[PDB]
Design a protein around this motif. Structure first.
Motif, mmCIF file in Angstrom:
data_model
loop_
_atom_site.group_PDB
_atom_site.id
_atom_site.type_symbol
_atom_site.label_atom_id
_atom_site.label_comp_id
_atom_site.label_asym_id
_atom_site.label_seq_id
_atom_site.Cartn_x
_atom_site.Cartn_y
_atom_site.Cartn_z
ATOM 1 N N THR A 29 0.805 -1.197 0.000
ATOM 2 C CA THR A 29 0.000 0.000 0.000
ATOM 3 C C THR A 29 0.856 1.273 0.000
ATOM 4 O O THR A 29 0.599 2.201 -0.771
ATOM 5 N N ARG A 30 1.866 1.320 0.870
ATOM 6 C CA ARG A 30 2.795 2.444 0.932
ATOM 7 C C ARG A 30 3.351 2.785 -0.437
ATOM 8 O O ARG A 30 3.516 3.952 -0.769
ATOM 9 N N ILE A 31 3.691 1.768 -1.213
ATOM 10 C CA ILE A 31 4.315 1.988 -2.504
ATOM 11 C C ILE A 31 3.258 2.314 -3.521
ATOM 12 O O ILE A 31 3.458 3.154 -4.389
ATOM 13 N N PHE A 32 2.131 1.626 -3.426
ATOM 14 C CA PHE A 32 1.080 1.774 -4.415
ATOM 15 C C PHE A 32 0.452 3.162 -4.355
ATOM 16 O O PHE A 32 0.472 3.896 -5.334
ATOM 17 N N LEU A 33 -0.089 3.523 -3.200
ATOM 18 C CA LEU A 33 -0.862 4.746 -3.081
ATOM 19 C C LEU A 33 -0.205 5.941 -3.755
ATOM 20 O O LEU A 33 -0.751 6.478 -4.714
ATOM 21 N N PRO A 34 0.987 6.352 -3.278
ATOM 22 C CA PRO A 34 1.586 7.595 -3.753
ATOM 23 C C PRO A 34 1.899 7.527 -5.215
ATOM 24 O O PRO A 34 1.757 8.514 -5.918
ATOM 25 N N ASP A 37 -1.427 7.926 -7.352
ATOM 26 C CA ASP A 37 -1.753 9.338 -7.498
ATOM 27 C C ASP A 37 -0.891 9.951 -8.570
ATOM 28 O O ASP A 37 -1.389 10.431 -9.583
ATOM 29 N N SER A 38 0.412 9.960 -8.330
ATOM 30 C CA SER A 38 1.350 10.534 -9.275
ATOM 31 C C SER A 38 0.901 10.301 -10.702
ATOM 32 O O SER A 38 0.935 11.213 -11.530
ATOM 33 N N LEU A 39 0.490 9.067 -10.987
ATOM 34 C CA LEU A 39 0.117 8.675 -12.343
ATOM 35 C C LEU A 39 -1.228 9.240 -12.777
ATOM 36 O O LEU A 39 -1.336 9.874 -13.822
ATOM 37 N N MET A 40 -2.244 8.983 -11.964
ATOM 38 C CA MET A 40 -3.573 9.524 -12.157
ATOM 39 C C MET A 40 -3.469 10.988 -12.492
ATOM 40 O O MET A 40 -3.891 11.415 -13.559
ATOM 41 N N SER A 41 -2.914 11.758 -11.563
ATOM 42 C CA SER A 41 -2.784 13.185 -11.740
ATOM 43 C C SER A 41 -1.541 13.530 -12.540
ATOM 44 O O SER A 41 -0.600 14.117 -12.002
ATOM 45 N N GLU A 67 0.690 -4.302 -10.986
ATOM 46 C CA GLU A 67 -0.671 -3.886 -10.780
ATOM 47 C C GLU A 67 -0.918 -2.568 -11.504
ATOM 48 O O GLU A 67 -1.912 -2.398 -12.214
ATOM 49 N N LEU A 68 0.002 -1.634 -11.320
ATOM 50 C CA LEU A 68 -0.063 -0.364 -12.019
ATOM 51 C C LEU A 68 -0.149 -0.567 -13.526
ATOM 52 O O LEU A 68 -0.986 0.061 -14.168
ATOM 53 N N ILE A 69 0.688 -1.432 -14.101
ATOM 54 C CA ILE A 69 0.604 -1.668 -15.546
ATOM 55 C C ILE A 69 -0.756 -2.259 -15.920
ATOM 56 O O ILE A 69 -1.329 -1.898 -16.947
ATOM 57 N N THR A 70 -1.275 -3.147 -15.076
ATOM 58 C CA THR A 70 -2.619 -3.684 -15.248
ATOM 59 C C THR A 70 -3.677 -2.574 -15.192
ATOM 60 O O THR A 70 -4.469 -2.411 -16.122
ATOM 61 N N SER A 71 -3.678 -1.806 -14.103
ATOM 62 C CA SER A 71 -4.581 -0.673 -13.960
ATOM 63 C C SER A 71 -4.512 0.266 -15.152
ATOM 64 O O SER A 71 -5.337 1.162 -15.278
ATOM 65 N N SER A 72 -3.517 0.084 -16.015
ATOM 66 C CA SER A 72 -3.404 0.905 -17.220
ATOM 67 C C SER A 72 -4.156 0.240 -18.383
ATOM 68 O O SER A 72 -4.941 0.891 -19.087
ATOM 69 N N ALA A 73 -3.914 -1.055 -18.580
ATOM 70 C CA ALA A 73 -4.739 -1.842 -19.477
ATOM 71 C C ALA A 73 -6.084 -2.080 -18.800
ATOM 72 O O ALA A 73 -6.376 -3.178 -18.303
ATOM 73 N N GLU A 187 9.940 10.301 -0.551
ATOM 74 C CA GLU A 187 10.553 9.126 0.019
ATOM 75 C C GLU A 187 9.479 8.182 0.583
ATOM 76 O O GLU A 187 8.712 8.538 1.478
ATOM 77 N N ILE A 188 9.421 6.982 0.025
ATOM 78 C CA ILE A 188 8.605 5.917 0.572
ATOM 79 C C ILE A 188 9.490 4.952 1.375
ATOM 80 O O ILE A 188 10.370 4.295 0.804
#
Length: 304
Positions: A29-34, A37-41, A67-73, A187-188
């Protein structure tokens, strides 16, 4: 029996599995969340994921990317290109990696032009590109940090960069004097193993490692180790002083930050310590040597 199944041992084994699994949800979660966002926005960041001290931590980090690459497709995230780079392939050698990451190239590798492309070629001429640099530590400081500041702040670059490394990474300093980066930099910090519990594990893991061993003497009186007996093979006690484990556990724990990294070290310290007893030849500096004593230099050698 049966009886090969009891509550107490099952529960404890289960509580561990659970504490471990919780820890990976917290880390994921720590890595995913921030980063999500960065990507979304649609914005540019430099993320530094620190405390990735074993391979399981790096596995977490690669899963968060999957997961991020998936959330893109799934149109759930704006289109982006991902590139992973292990920094243990060579320094000037990485620039062409960043180039290739930016676009499928090949001449030399002008930092000057490569930089002009990023920050000058128009933004509508390219889509979002995310680079993960694994273990920059060494190869990556100073100028590069500046280049990063220009590429990332530029409004033509469409670049976020993620670095993953251990704790012995401290650019939280150099970042502070760079406002145009500090503003794009997060920093994460992943879950730390806990000093006490860690060193207690090394001590206990040391006891277990240090068990008698065997050397074989020849007609040459020389000494050699034995493949785990014959008459010309003697047992050697492998010991270590209590007050000295305390110290070594502490320092190794410090230098390690992960049970996985510590144990690899103990294992090899022990192999070195043995390799030394046979050097000593059973006779050294006047007195004779009948057992082997563990000393901290054996660990330093293990480390490097």
């Amino acid at each position: 029996p049966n009886a090969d199944i009891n509550l107490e041992e099952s529960i404890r084994e289960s509580l561990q599995k659970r504490e471990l699994l919780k820890s990976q949800v917290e880390d994921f979660t720590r890595i995913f969340l921030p980063i999500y966002d960065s990507l979304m926005s649609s914005q540019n960041k430099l993320f530094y994921i620190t405390n990735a001290d074993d391979s399981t931590k790096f596995q977490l980090v690669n899963d968060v990317m999957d997961e991020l690459i998936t959330s893109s497709a799934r149109k759930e995230l704006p289109i982006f290109d991902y590139i992973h780079i292990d920094a243990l392939e060579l320094m000037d050698a990485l620039y062409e990696k960043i180039w290739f990451a930016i676009s499928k190239e090949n001449g030399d590798i002008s930092l000057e032009a490569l930089n002009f492309y990023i920050t000058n070629v128009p933004k509508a001429k390219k889509r979002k590109t995310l680079i993960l640099i694994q273990n920059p530590e060494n190869l990556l400081s100073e100028k590069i940090l500046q280049y990063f500041e220009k590429w990332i702040s530029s409004k033509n670059s469409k670049l976020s960069i993620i670095c993953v490394g251990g704790h012995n990474v401290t650019i939280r300093e150099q970042i502070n004097i760079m406002p145009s980066l500090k503003a794009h930099f997060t920093e994460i910090k992943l879950n730390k193993v806990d000093k006490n519990e860690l060193q207690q594990m090394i001590i206990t893991r040391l006891k277990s490692l240090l068990k008698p061993f065997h050397v074989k003497v020849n007609d040459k009186k020389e000494m050699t180790i034995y493949n785990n007996i014959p008459d010309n093979v003697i047992v050697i006690n492998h010991k270590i002083n209590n007050k000295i484990t305390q110290l070594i556990a502490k320092n190794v724990a410090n230098v390690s930050g992960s049970t996985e990294k510590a144990f690899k070290i103990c294992e090899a310290a022990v192999e070195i310590s043995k390799k030394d007893f046979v050097r000593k030849g059973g006779l050294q500096k006047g007195k004779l040597v009948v057992s082997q004593e563990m000393v901290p230099r054996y660990f330093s050698e293990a480390i490097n």
